[PDB]
Subunit: 277 residues, 2 copies
């Protein structure tokens, strides 16, 4: 199907603006939740999940709640990441961070609530059977937990200001960043009920796509410095570009192995967006 | 069934001590998670869950994962509660708090991880059909989220150090503490597949039990029930709730032996 990226982003944004109902207890909790939820980003995680379903010949709206959940999980990690005991960021995308507007305690709890809400949302989605709902929930909890997204944050924070090797660096990005990405495509594969071998290719695809993400960003930070512990600091500039290209190629490779009844133009298009620059 | 309190607590403590495995990433996450999880206590929430499953003529072991999930939810909020930006506790029943042993950032992450693992645990439980997992899971997230446990904490923090009226104090208690306890009973009711009438009595019991619990605590400690009503007023409320809890227990279909649930109200009413 023809789905312009900006038209999906728009739909996601409309759903996210109205995804939490106003306070019954008269606190700022839900305006804090909504504040970060509406911060406005690129929304690649939800969009990835949506586009993956479309490539798999499945009604993309089946995955809207899962996509919303996914963005809630990403939002919550940011609110916690930004806190003074952690990254300590006062600004993100030109706006004040949650804790700068609401205090540390509101932000902690706004994070906790969003984590919780993500699970409520999937478990309540009537477009999916209970069997598929369990699969998505199981996958989200593993992707987000101690051996996924939060485990990577632990590893990242432990590594702060240390010269770690490349297996460590990759371990951090694979769990901290890649597990949500892999959730996006595999939750879709699960809603679509595609066959084991298509699942395998979508898996590798998602892994390589995920590794592209942070490499590109390290390169852009370096390209930026050229004009008037990371991938380029370990590998140098050309090593990083080589790494990027290798993941690009393995991603693109993996798509060409998906059986021909599925049209991957969308997935392939996301690879190129991650690759560009 | 004959299920002694001390034996169930012992089993629950053993399941919890092996509930999280060491991970390939080599950090303190799993250690911090387990540190707080083994801090031990009354374990009344998981115990409540198992006991009522048994009261409902159902294998209590069917709710063991749900019970462990419940205790994980309980301990994560304790980890977050004690943080300097919140209650700022350095001590909890004699032992140092999570963040004082492992630092603030680790403690925050141990909490997030525990929250997440609870939903993994119920998701993965093969003793339950997918249909009941969803029922339990949906209930856990509503009881723990912004209209439940965490919303209750919002209200509490927002009200810190100021005279709050009685209906506000009860709203805080109903959500901050009451929602989980009610989950312990209603999740068990869903696993057992008991009827609607039985559920309404159980819900009502759990509600009155929770209030009974909160009033008892304020009384034992000699804003609060005592400071608002005075000691005798607080004692009136305590007894009112004990009796309402028991009234609900006697209205339940007598195919179910409510003895264990009665033993709980009496354990905590008496001291």
């Amino acid at each position: 199907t023809n789905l312009p990226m900006n038209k999906l982003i728009d739909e996601v944004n409309n759903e996210l603006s109205v995804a939490i109902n106003k306070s019954v207890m008269d606190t700022q909790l839900e305006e804090s939740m909504l504040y970060s939820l509406n911060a406005g980003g690129k929304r690649i995680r939800p969009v990835l999940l949506l586009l993956t379903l479309d490539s798999l010949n499945t009604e993309y709206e089946l995955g809207m709640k899962s996509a919303i959940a996914l963005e809630m999980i990403h939002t919550y990690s940011l609110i916690h990441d930004d806190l003074p005991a952690m990254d300590n960021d006062d600004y993100r995308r030109g706006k004040l961070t949650n804790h700068k507007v609401y205090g540390e305690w509101t932000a902690i709890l706004a994070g906790d609530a969003l984590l919780t809400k993500a699970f409520e949302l999937i478990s309540s989605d009537d477009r999916l059977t209970d069997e598929v709902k369990i699969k998505v929930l199981q996958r989200l909890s593993i992707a987000s937990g101690h051996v996924g997204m939060v485990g990577g944050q632990m590893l990242d924070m432990q590594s702060e200001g240390q010269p770690i090797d490349l297996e460590t660096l990759e371990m951090i990005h694979k769990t901290k960043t890649g597990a949500l990405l892999t959730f996006a495509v595999m939750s879709a594969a699960d809603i679509a009920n595609v066959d084991d071998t298509t699942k395998e290719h979508l898996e590798s695809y998602s892994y390589h796509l995920g590794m592209m993400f942070q490499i590109k960003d390290d390169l852009l930070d370096c390209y930026g410095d050229e004009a008037k512990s990371t991938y380029v600091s370990l590998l140098g500039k050309d090593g990083a570009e080589d790494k990027l290209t290798y993941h690009r190629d393995a991603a693109v490779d993996e798509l060409t192995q998906i059986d021909e009844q599925f049209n991957t133009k969308h997935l392939l298009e996301i690879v190129d967006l991650f690759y560009s620059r």
